[PDB]
Amino acid sequence: VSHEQFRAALQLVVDPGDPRSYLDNFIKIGEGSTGIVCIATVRGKLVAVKKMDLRKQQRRELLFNEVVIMRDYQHENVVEMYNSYLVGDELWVVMEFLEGGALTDIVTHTRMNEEQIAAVCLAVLQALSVLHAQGVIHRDIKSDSILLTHDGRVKLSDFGFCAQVSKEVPRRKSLVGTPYWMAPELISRLPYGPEVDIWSLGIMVIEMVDGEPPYFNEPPLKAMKMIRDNLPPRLKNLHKVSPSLKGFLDRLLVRDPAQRATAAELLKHPFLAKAGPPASIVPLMRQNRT
Ligand SMILES: CCn1cnc2c(Nc3cccc(Cl)c3)nc(N[C@@H]3CCCC[C@H]3N)nc21
Ligand SMILES: [Cl-]
């Protein structure tokens, strides 16, 4: 499929026009897999703009999947998209700005308690149960993909790797994700489904408890071989965690995806009863630390 034809299909979907009319004061706040993210001001609300080069993608079709999903799925725990545009060779998606940043910064700089860990898992499982029911697989669940509001509410972001399964095509086979968070069946190149996100969430629980995913200091291909061949990873800090948290994590990090717990199942797990309110996360954020 041609670039001119791909851009053409995307043009049918995005908002027409040049948003450099509506926006100014662009400040780069980071980089992802698919492009860069800036903050900008509307002509006075401030927004986040993700900018992706149509010609520089390993899997260009995923750009399409991204826009269509956030357009079609609004949930309290999912980052809201306001608009999307084509600007030269770039797809721009305009989204709400979340002042609390990403969970990565919390997990690498602080130790979360179980109330805080439970609140983050509850929020993510709520988003995923709704997405999974409609056949949407996120495929990049990790702390970097979890954003926080000023008052400590959790929002799933970074839908640039998502896919949708259906009755007609109920499994994917593509190798998409981030090595250390990838489910064994996905690493192995087997037909997979929504269950891959449950494993990835398990790995993000490890991040929240231990600060890092398993095998993080290994080359990514070596970590993927270990994920694929070995017993499920265990918490380095095990004696430090409750029986509720261990039993919860034991249901996520199940190698056989057919025996892995679903998002709907896990929403009924007693560990999530520990979830604290959003205000419990606030003191973990960079702006409130010293
Ligand atoms: C859904 C798009 N989006 C809205 N608001 C975002 C966001 N907020 C903040 C808030 C405070 C500091 C920073 Cl660095 C980002 N960060 C943000 N972070 C970057 C985006 C790409 C690189 C990884 C991730 N940390 N993404 C944000
Ligand atoms: Cl249990």
Residue numbers in the entry: 299 to 341, 344 to 590
According to the publication:
In order to elucidate the molecular mechanisms of inhibition, we determined the structures of a 2, 6, 9-trisubstituted purine inhibitor (N-(cis-2-Aminocyclohexyl)-N-(3-chlorophenyl)-9-ethyl-9H-purine-2, 6-diamine) with PAK4 and PAK5. The 2, 6, 9-trisubstituted purine inhibitor (CGP74514A) has been described as a potent and cell-permeable inhibitor of Cdk1/cyclin B (Giocanti et al., 1999; Wang et al., 2003). To shed light on this conformational plasticity of group II PAKs, we identified small-molecule inhibitors and used them to trap the kinase domains in their closed conformations. Binding of adenine-mimetic inhibitors to the active sites of PAK4 and PAK5 resulted in the expected clamping movement of the two kinase lobes and closure of the active site, as will be described below. In PAK4 and PAK5, the inhibitor interacted with conserved active site residues. The binding orientations of the purine scaffold in PAK4 and PAK5 differed slightly; however, the mode of binding was identical to the one observed in the Src kinase complex (Dalgarno et al., 2006). As an example, the interactions of the inhibitor and the PAK4 kinase domain are described. In PAK4, and in the analogous residues in PAK5, the inhibitor forms two hydrogen bonds with the hinge backbone residue Leu398. In addition, several hydrophobic interactions with the active site residues Phe397, Ile327, Ala348, and Val335 in the N-terminal kinase lobe and Leu398, Leu447, Gly401 and Val379 in the C-terminal kinase lobe are present. Similar rearrangements of helix αC were also observed when the PAK4 inhibitor complex was compared with PAK4Etgly, suggesting that this novel, to our knowledge, mechanism is conserved in group II PAKs (not shown). In the PAK4EtGly structure, the corresponding arginine (Arg359) forms hydrogen bonds with the phosphate moiety of the phosphorylated activation loop residue S474; in the PAK4 purine complex, Arg359 forms an indirect interaction with that residue via a sulfate ion present in the crystallization solution.
PAKs are serine/threonine protein kinases that are regulated by Rho GTPases of the Cdc42 and Rac families (Knaus et al., 1995; Manser et al., 1994; Martin et al., 1995). In humans, the PAK family comprises six members, which are classified into groups I (PAK1, -2, and -3) and II (PAK4, -5, and -6) based on their domain architecture and regulatory properties (Bokoch, 2003; Jaffer and Chernoff, 2002; Kumar et al., 2006; Zhao and Manser, 2005). Group II PAKs (PAK4–6) regulate a wide variety of cellular functions, and PAK deregulation has been linked to tumor development. Comparison of five high-resolution crystal structures comprising the kinase domains of all three monophosphorylated, enzymatically active group II PAK family members revealed a number of catalytically productive and nonproductive conformers presumably representing snapshots of catalytic domain movements during catalysis.
